[PDB]
Enzyme design. Sequence first.
Site, PDB file in Angstrom:
ATOM      1  N   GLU A 116      12.515  15.807   6.128  1.00 37.03           N
ATOM      2  CA  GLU A 116      13.951  15.997   6.253  1.00 37.03           C
ATOM      3  C   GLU A 116      14.770  15.136   5.294  1.00 37.03           C
ATOM      4  O   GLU A 116      15.941  15.424   5.062  1.00 37.03           O
ATOM      5  CB  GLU A 116      14.385  15.734   7.698  1.00 37.03           C
ATOM      6  CG  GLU A 116      13.702  16.656   8.716  1.00 37.03           C
ATOM      7  CD  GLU A 116      13.946  16.231  10.147  1.00 37.03           C
ATOM      8  OE1 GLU A 116      13.834  15.019  10.420  1.00 37.03           O
ATOM      9  OE2 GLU A 116      14.238  17.101  11.000  1.00 37.03           O
ATOM     10  N   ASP A 175      14.472  26.528  14.699  1.00 36.16           N
ATOM     11  CA  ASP A 175      13.903  27.321  15.781  1.00 36.16           C
ATOM     12  C   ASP A 175      14.973  27.698  16.801  1.00 36.16           C
ATOM     13  O   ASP A 175      16.104  27.211  16.737  1.00 36.16           O
ATOM     14  CB  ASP A 175      12.793  26.503  16.450  1.00 36.16           C
ATOM     15  CG  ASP A 175      13.303  25.179  17.007  1.00 36.16           C
ATOM     16  OD1 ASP A 175      13.793  25.173  18.153  1.00 36.16           O
ATOM     17  OD2 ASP A 175      13.231  24.150  16.299  1.00 36.16           O
ATOM     18  N   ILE A 197      12.643  21.039  23.080  1.00 34.58           N
ATOM     19  CA  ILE A 197      12.964  22.197  23.899  1.00 34.58           C
ATOM     20  C   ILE A 197      12.172  23.374  23.336  1.00 34.58           C
ATOM     21  O   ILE A 197      12.556  23.978  22.327  1.00 34.58           O
ATOM     22  CB  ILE A 197      14.487  22.482  23.873  1.00 34.58           C
ATOM     23  CG1 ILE A 197      15.259  21.182  24.134  1.00 34.58           C
ATOM     24  CG2 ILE A 197      14.850  23.538  24.909  1.00 34.58           C
ATOM     25  CD1 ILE A 197      14.959  20.419  25.455  1.00 34.58           C
ATOM     26  N   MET A 251      16.703  15.799  19.048  1.00 40.89           N
ATOM     27  CA  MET A 251      16.438  14.502  19.658  1.00 40.89           C
ATOM     28  C   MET A 251      17.170  13.216  19.301  1.00 40.89           C
ATOM     29  O   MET A 251      17.150  12.273  20.087  1.00 40.89           O
ATOM     30  CB  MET A 251      14.899  14.426  19.625  1.00 40.89           C
ATOM     31  CG  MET A 251      14.211  15.608  20.317  1.00 40.89           C
ATOM     32  SD  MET A 251      12.394  15.707  20.088  1.00 40.89           S
ATOM     33  CE  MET A 251      11.845  14.244  20.979  1.00 40.89           C
ATOM     34  N   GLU A 252      17.831  13.165  18.147  1.00 43.16           N
ATOM     35  CA  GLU A 252      18.518  11.929  17.780  1.00 43.16           C
ATOM     36  C   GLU A 252      20.035  11.829  17.672  1.00 43.16           C
ATOM     37  O   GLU A 252      20.596  10.756  17.867  1.00 43.16           O
ATOM     38  CB  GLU A 252      17.917  11.588  16.401  1.00 43.16           C
ATOM     39  CG  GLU A 252      16.372  11.473  16.377  1.00 43.16           C
ATOM     40  CD  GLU A 252      15.671  12.799  16.129  1.00 43.16           C
ATOM     41  OE1 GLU A 252      16.314  13.748  15.625  1.00 43.16           O
ATOM     42  OE2 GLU A 252      14.463  12.890  16.429  1.00 43.16           O
ATOM     43  N   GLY A 279      17.178  23.043  17.486  1.00 44.43           N
ATOM     44  CA  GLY A 279      16.915  24.343  18.077  1.00 44.43           C
ATOM     45  C   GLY A 279      18.243  24.992  18.427  1.00 44.43           C
ATOM     46  O   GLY A 279      19.119  24.346  18.995  1.00 44.43           O
TER      47      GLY A 279
END
Lengths: 230, 230
Positions: free
Chosen positions: B13, B198, B153, B174-175, B79
Amino acid sequence: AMMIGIIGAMEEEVTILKNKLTQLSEISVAHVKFYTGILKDREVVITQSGIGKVNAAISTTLLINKFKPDVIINTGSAGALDESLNVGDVLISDDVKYHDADATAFGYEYGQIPQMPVAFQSSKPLIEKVSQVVQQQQLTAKVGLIVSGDSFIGSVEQRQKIKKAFPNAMAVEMEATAIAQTCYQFNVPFVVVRAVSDLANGEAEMSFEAFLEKAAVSSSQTVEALVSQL
Amino acid sequence: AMMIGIIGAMEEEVTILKNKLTQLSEISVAHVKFYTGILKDREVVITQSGIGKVNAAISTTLLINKFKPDVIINTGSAGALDESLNVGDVLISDDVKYHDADATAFGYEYGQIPQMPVAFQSSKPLIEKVSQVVQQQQLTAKVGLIVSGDSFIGSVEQRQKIKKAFPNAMAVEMEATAIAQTCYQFNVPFVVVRAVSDLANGEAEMSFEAFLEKAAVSSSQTVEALVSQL
Ligand SMILES: Nc1ncnc2c([C@@H]3O[C@H](CO)[C@@H](O)[C@H]3O)n[nH]c12
Ligand SMILES: Nc1ncnc2c([C@@H]3O[C@H](CO)[C@@H](O)[C@H]3O)n[nH]c12
């Protein structure tokens, strides 16, 4: 020569120890409050971290990066998962893990953060030392797995979910594992020395309010005695 | 005069932007990797944080405390929760909240950390600026609430739980919220500029593997263009 960091979330959890310091100075960075001084002839920096994973991580990262501690002690309260424990009982960490981290979709163990260890390990020399301390203070205590999350466990449903996933978990609270993960990243030895404030069940919130003071006293008494032996 | 921090979790990333820096230096503290240099005639420090709340908090706390950034940009994947979004679409944060934090037992709003705000707010001037950037880059994008947790997820069950709790949530990862909470504690303006990898459903894990590269390209292209305008 020796510097001891002490972290707790709430003012009530750090006030007893803070008022026992000599050479007291207060430092503030972000929302973190630091109190530097001497405790039982030992250099310490007491830190009020705020609640939850991120507040704990932030606080632990400045504490390490500003004061270069040799060891870190996490104090405060927690909900008991072991039915033999009672409010006020002292809780000593042996490993710690997150009970709310789920990256199993990638094949990681439940509770494991991607690319991190499944668990973090308290310093064995610290576990041994504080084990001697609680006995000589004649305070009921227990060593075991402590699990952390960003939720207050105040229902039997939440409690059963954790018990099923971590059968050996002894207690649950919000910062220990975050502090441990931070100590792992900086390779600083740690140990958790908390006390039971509730049974993490449908009365947990009320019990917490009722026994916050009791838990602060037993955990603080143990921490103070431990510091004097380091 | 102006220093821009850029944080992403994974090497994949941050590699595109890292390879575009001139005056490159690499610094390492704990598990955090920093790459200082110039991007589009602007000073920046690119940070590879690791995954999850605590890794993000640690990374953001050193980035702020070592480099004194004026603004922080969080990039990476996420996501999609908004059905109109497709893989590769750019995601711009407007507020961010935790979807896995439950301290409602004390009366706090679901997702709220005790004694913190319910949500954290991206810098409005940054939202406006990157909104102009994505249009001129002709990259499909959307501004909205992004929610964070310490879980991937990857199931409709997890996805529905979030959608029910945060009907307006646009994406999940997540962050972001951990970074935002850290920026709140240090009062540093931030904005999240990620891309869909996703649909956070039963194919999420496979989709993530398939579109990680695509998401890195669109989010990086937007970040690079945004930096050039700051
Ligand atoms: N049953 C329980 N569940 C989760 N956290 C706690 C705690 C601790 O007290 C605070 C509760 O919000 C927090 O710092 C946490 O670490 N005591 N009892 C708890
Ligand atoms: N459906 C999803 N759920 C949670 N996180 C992610 C992500 C992001 O990619 C990494 C997945 O472990 C992590 O950094 C997170 O922020 N992409 N798609 C996701």
